[PDB]
Amino acid sequence: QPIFLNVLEAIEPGVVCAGHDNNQPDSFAALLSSLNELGERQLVHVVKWAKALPGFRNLHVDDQMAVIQYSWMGLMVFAMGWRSFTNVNSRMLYFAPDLVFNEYRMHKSRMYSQCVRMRHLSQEFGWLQITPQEFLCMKALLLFSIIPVDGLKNQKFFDELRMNYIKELDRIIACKRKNPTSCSRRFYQLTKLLDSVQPIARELHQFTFDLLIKSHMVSVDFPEMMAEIISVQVPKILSGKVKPIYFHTQ
Numbered sequence: 001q002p003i004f005l006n007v008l009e010a011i012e013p014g015v016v017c018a019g020h021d022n023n024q025p026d027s028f029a030a031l032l033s034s035l036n037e038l039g040e041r042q043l044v045h046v047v048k049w050a051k052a053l054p055g056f057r058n059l060h061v062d063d064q065m066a067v068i069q070y071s072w073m074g075l076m077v078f079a080m081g082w083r084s085f086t087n088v089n090s091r092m093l094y095f096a097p098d099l100v101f102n103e104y105r106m107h108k109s110r111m112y113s114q115c116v117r118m119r120h121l122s123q124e125f126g127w128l129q130i131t132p133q134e135f136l137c138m139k140a141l142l143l144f145s146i147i148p149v150d151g152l153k154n155q156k157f158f159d160e161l162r163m164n165y166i167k168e169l170d171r172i173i174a175c176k177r178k179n180p181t182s183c184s185r186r187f188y189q190l191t192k193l194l195d196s197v198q199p200i201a202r203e204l205h206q207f208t209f210d211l212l213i214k215s216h217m218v219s220v221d222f223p224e225m226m227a228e229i230i231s232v233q234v235p236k237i238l239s240g241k242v243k244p245i246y247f248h249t250q
């Protein structure tokens with residue numbers, strides 16, 4: 001029995017609802033305030049999920065919050081892609097059971113191009129035939145894929161942790177496979193899939209950072225936690241002080 005898989009499967013967070021009043025007209029201001037409240041909500045879970053991950057509390061405490069604060073975009077975008085694939089075969093974006101974006105919501109949110117990228121992503125789960133086991137280990141690996149260029153408080157611990165999550169993903173690929181040509185191709189495939197989250201996550205950082213700046217102008221509410229992470233932590237990403245870790249050069 002794989003102990004590592006039992007844990008991921010057990011800690012996976014349940015459905016989270018956005019709180020969106022679906023009887024309102026689909027306006028930019030309402031779509032985004034709801035995506036924003038959706039972020040606050042998802043964030044509470046992400047924190048609880050990350051803390052229960054095997055080895056996570058071995059990281060220094062300031063590094064525990066830094067990694068969560070750097071990587072939430074990618075992790076949530078990925079999860080959402082998976083929810084989109086499993087529920088509606090990647091036809092729409094399944095943000096929350098109460099906030100499914102049709103083509104029209106995509107246009108009204110004014111992120112049609114990001115949503116188009118987010119949708120290609122969700123389709124990849126289908127095209128690549130990702131298993132829930134692979135999905136889960138990839139998502140944990142995503143929590144460890146962005147860090148300051150000066151390094152963390154205890155960079156050593158982090159590197160150990162992340163090396164292990166790499167092995168586990170490699171373990172879940174090998175656990176039922178014939179010859180090592182396909183084990184290779186698959187690991188290549190999934191590593192490229194993970195890389196692909198980063199540019200998408202970078203576009204959303206830019207977007208939401210812009211959005212918060214003119215939040216008052218455009219009538220868009222940001223909950224406190226979202227306000228603080230976007231104004232404190234996102235700018236370090238955008239200014240190049242915090243960078244994603246790619247498996248392959250872009």
Ligand SMILES: C[C@@H](Cc1ccc(O)c(O)c1)[C@@H](C)Cc1ccc(O)c(O)c1
Binds near residue numbers: 003054055165
């Ligand atoms: C994810 C873990 C990998 C793992 C642990 C136990 C298992 O039975 C397994 O199959 C894989 C990883 C964290 C190993 C580890 C052990 C001890 C630690 O202190 C630490 O930071 C990390």
Ligand SMILES: C[C@]12CC[C@H]3[C@@H](CCC4=CC(=O)CC[C@@]43C)[C@@H]1CC[C@@H]2O
Binds near residue numbers: 032042073076
């Ligand atoms: C950041 C954001 C709210 C949080 C959104 C994000 C789009 C991606 C996303 C996917 C989810 O499933 C949870 C909400 C999040 C994480 C939105 C883009 C602009 C808006 O400000």
